[PDB]
């Protein structure tokens, strides 16, 4: 919320593994202009990782890291 709100960058590689919540912070969906829509999980080190929204494990990390409750 107080880092880089202008991080509208696309993604490409997708990690397939449960990241250690100890180093996880939040997440963020890619932009619509990107040619490959993908979710992203941010860690405590400041490194945002891209991932696929299809994988159920990712849907569990997004709802857990933070719920989309913004109108």
From Swiss-Prot:
Expression sites (tissue/organ): Ubiquitously expressed at low levels in various tissues including heart and ovary.
Cystines in this chain: 10-34, 11-50
Chief location category: secreted
Entry GO CC: extracellular space
Quaternary structure, from the entry: Monomer.
Job description of the protein: Chemoattractant for eosinophils and basophils. Acts as a ligand for C-C chemokine receptor CCR3 which triggers Ca(2+) mobilization in eosinophils. Also acts as a ligand for CX3C chemokine receptor CX3CR1, inducing cell chemotaxis.
Name listed for the protein in its UniProt record: C-C motif chemokine 26
Native species: Homo sapiens (Human)
Organism phylogeny: Eukaryota, Metazoa, Chordata, Craniata, Vertebrata
Gene expressing this chain: CCL26
